[PDB]
Amino acid sequence: SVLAASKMVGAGCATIALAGVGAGLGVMFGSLINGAARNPNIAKQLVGYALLGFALTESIALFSLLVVFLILFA
Amino acid sequence: SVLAASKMVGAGCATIALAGVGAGLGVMFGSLINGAARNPNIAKQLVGYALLGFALTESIALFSLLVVFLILFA
Amino acid sequence: SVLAASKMVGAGCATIALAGVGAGLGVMFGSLINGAARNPNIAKQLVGYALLGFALTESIALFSLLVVFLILFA
Amino acid sequence: SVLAASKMVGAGCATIALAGVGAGLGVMFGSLINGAARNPNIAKQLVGYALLGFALTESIALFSLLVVFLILFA
Amino acid sequence: SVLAASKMVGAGCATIALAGVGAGLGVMFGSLINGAARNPNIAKQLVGYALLGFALTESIALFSLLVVFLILFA
Amino acid sequence: SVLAASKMVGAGCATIALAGVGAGLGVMFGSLINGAARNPNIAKQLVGYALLGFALTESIALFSLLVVFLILFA
Amino acid sequence: SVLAASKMVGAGCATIALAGVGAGLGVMFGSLINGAARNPNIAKQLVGYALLGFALTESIALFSLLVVFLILFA
Amino acid sequence: SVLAASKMVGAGCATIALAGVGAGLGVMFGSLINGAARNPNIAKQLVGYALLGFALTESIALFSLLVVFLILFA
Amino acid sequence: GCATIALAGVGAGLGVMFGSLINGAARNPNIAKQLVGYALLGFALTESIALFSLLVVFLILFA
Amino acid sequence: EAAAPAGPKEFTEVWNKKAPSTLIVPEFPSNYTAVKAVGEGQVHGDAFPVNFYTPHSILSQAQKDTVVLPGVDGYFGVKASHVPTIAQLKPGVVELHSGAESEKFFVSGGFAFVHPNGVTDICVLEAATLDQVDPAAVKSALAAASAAQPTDEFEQAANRAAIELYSALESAVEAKA
Amino acid sequence: LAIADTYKVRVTFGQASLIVEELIKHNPQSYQILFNKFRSAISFKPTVATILSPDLLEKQLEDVTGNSLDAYDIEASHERSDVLRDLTEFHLGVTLYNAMLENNCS
Amino acid sequence: APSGPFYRVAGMSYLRYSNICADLLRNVLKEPFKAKAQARQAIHFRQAPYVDGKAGASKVYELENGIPKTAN
């Protein structure tokens, strides 16, 4: 079963793509702390900018996670 | 099945372009939180600049989602 | 046992995404220290954005740690 | 059947170069939001420097998408 | 053995995740030196944010050591 | 014909040199947008250094795609 | 001809050194744009350090394809 | 002749270290242009730290080149 | 051969440290000889990882 | 958005209605300045006019080619056409250069402007040249500064200001050229 | 407020700073300074001088399709709203030191 | 309560901070030059807040040693 053997080394090697969405959300949520430290009066607005950026950067993380059941479960 | 096993180990290595796209988008969305903390006056003009780049940096993500569809389903 | 042998190499390559969340939470808690040095009067407010981002960045660190459970045991 | 197999492994490792233009464009479009917040008077002139730098960095991404197409269909 | 052989490269390719916490801790501990150079009166409060953040980045690093302890020793 | 098989996975594993070039172009083109936003009176001279920088960092990209053409077509 | 096949994947993995020299060249040519924006009076002196930096950063990129040409043509 | 094959696939993987020291020399020589544009009266002095930083970082560029000649010619 | 990719990052880390030596001496040029005292301490205590990485290269090639 | 153009010539339109014509128009400080910031010029090559000011003395109004200012993120040099900059200065040495010679005033703080017409302005409160400073009195006062610890942080706002001023003054003369 | 005895010994900048500090107790959007400018020994022009508070009115009255102050690169510690607060207090104290010194010579 | 630099979070104004740095530079000068320091350092004025046209008594500053570095 070399076809099913290459599934998990394939879907495993697909999962390096979830590194940069963590490295991206780290500088993004680090800049949420940096932005609120510089302008604390609009900290009510800046979380709405981070969560809008959290959903659209995860779009990659659900583009990366749709591969691993397109390898295994397809 | 050495040919069909090759497409899972191939497309697994293909989608890790999304790591750099996920690392780039976090720099871009984090740069708006620094940009909105500087200017609250034009803060929604800058949202049009991020969603411009979010369409244009994901462009490479769907160029890398092209390859996992052109390896597995072609 | 080539299906079983290619589990552990693939599930080994799947947890390299834990570097990117490690690089993400490192710069996020770096910008918490730098952000508190701007104004320490909102320092406890800035941890409310830090652990919000920390819980939302470990969302990938659990999304990548379920796939290593979905390869070895599923 | 290994030469057609080794093409599918090749183009997957070939499009990892699309991560860097994914990380490069997020820095360049991230600096567009910081540049426009620093100076909203010339805010769309910086878009004229962004889209020229976008298509000049896209030339790298078209150089990487070429090799994905070249080692398969030539 | 093909299973017990591939455990080593399955563990070896799994512990590359310690690079990201190593590059993550340097940004976090680098911002302690920079955060105390700005505000040296709250310099011991920023250690209270450093070792809090050091615990929450190592927990992902210890998540990367538990996988090399169950691959080798399931 | 395993030599022609290793040419495809050799050329695919060769062109990730375009990634750091692509991330290198985005750093330089990002500083073009920031450097023009600081003083736009000298903005056209900075394009004369951005395009001078772009032609010299693609010079690495010249040396990486000639390798791909030397193992494949030579 | 596995020895001559390993020259193809050997020269492929060797060329990945040109990624990091391109990312360094973008930071060096990016700081030239930031450097010439701050003081446009000494922009002829700063390219005297950039081309000095260009002569020394690719001085090890020429070491990299020296390895490529010694594992291809020797 | 698998040892002469593994002599050369390890040689390409050995010289990937020339990427990061190429990224190191670009950040350091970028910080020479950023430092000489800050105050150019000590621009003579700062090259004495850049060439000092050059010769102490390119030791790693030959430490990996020590490894390259030790698996090519040993 | 796969052991010595790790010399890239310690080569990349020292470019940040020696780059911050040039960045730190441009901002405080009167204490510049103290900053080389912090650079070469940081140089010699990061080159330990450059030989920690070379340790595994010499234990795989010859042990 | 510029729907409210306040100005010196626009002060006179409302002043000719409510205030009587018995008085002449009151003067403004813009009417005594020959140099502005928005009208470009004043560089004509490699020189730029430097105006170094205390409240009690005009220290320089000549044209230099290099000015080294001690900003709060460190020292920085100003060439002929620098970027327009509002730089807050810490205690340090303002260093003027007209050529091969240099004058080293030690300042106590106060801002420094670089303007889009190339002119620059250094605005300090007390600027003593280092020949007027003797180092025997400097760290004897730092011995009185960094030893007393009042937890009232109005006093260690002053003591932090006392530490960084005296310590930058020690290295101002101990690192002599 | 009524301030007197400012010319008994001399006019100093620290005296003008404490006078300007009591004008930071009230936090207006403008500071009109009426004084006699010493033109010559014969003529004395009465001069008004205004200081616009940073986040009240100074950031808004420099807007010219964006801002006139955005051409300047802030090289200070905190953000521009704190640089301009330290600058307009400096600008109040400088022109109050000059006002009562011009008026004393007049 | 407020934020900003270290003097601004203490309630100290910039004019009080920059004068505290100013006279502390004048304290360590040479004696031919330090003689010209306490001239421009002395603060001699008085004030009276007028609530409705009736002041109170006074607040007389007679300090010859600079701006008060103590709390205010």
UniProtKB/TrEMBL annotation, chain I:
It comes from Polytomella sp. Pringsheim 198.80. It is found in: Membrane; Mitochondrion. Residues 1-60 form the V-ATPase proteolipid subunit C-like domain. Belongs to the ATPase C chain family. This is Mitochondrial ATP synthase subunit c. The chain crosses the membrane at residues 1-23, 35-62.
UniProtKB/TrEMBL annotation, chain J:
It is found in: Mitochondrion inner membrane. Pfam families: ATP-synt_DE_N (PF02823). Keywords: Hydrogen ion transport, Ion transport, Membrane, Mitochondrion, Mitochondrion inner membrane, Transit peptide, Transport. Residues 50-120 form the ATP synthase F1 complex delta/epsilon subunit N-terminal domain. Coiled coil: none annotated. It comes from the Eukaryota. Signal peptide: none annotated. CDD domains: F1-ATPase_delta. One of its GO terms (cellular component) is proton-transporting ATP synthase complex. GO terms for molecular function: proton-transporting ATP synthase activity, rotational mechanism. Belongs to the ATPase epsilon chain family. PANTHER family: ATP SYNTHASE DELTA/EPSILON CHAIN (PTHR13822), ATP SYNTHASE SUBUNIT DELTA, MITOCHONDRIAL (PTHR13822:SF7). This is Mitochondrial ATP synthase subunit delta. It comes from Polytomella sp. Pringsheim 198.80.
Automatic annotation (TrEMBL), chain K:
It comes from the Eukaryota. It is found in: Mitochondrion inner membrane. Belongs to the ATPase gamma chain family. This is F-ATPase gamma subunit. It comes from Polytomella sp. Pringsheim 198.80.
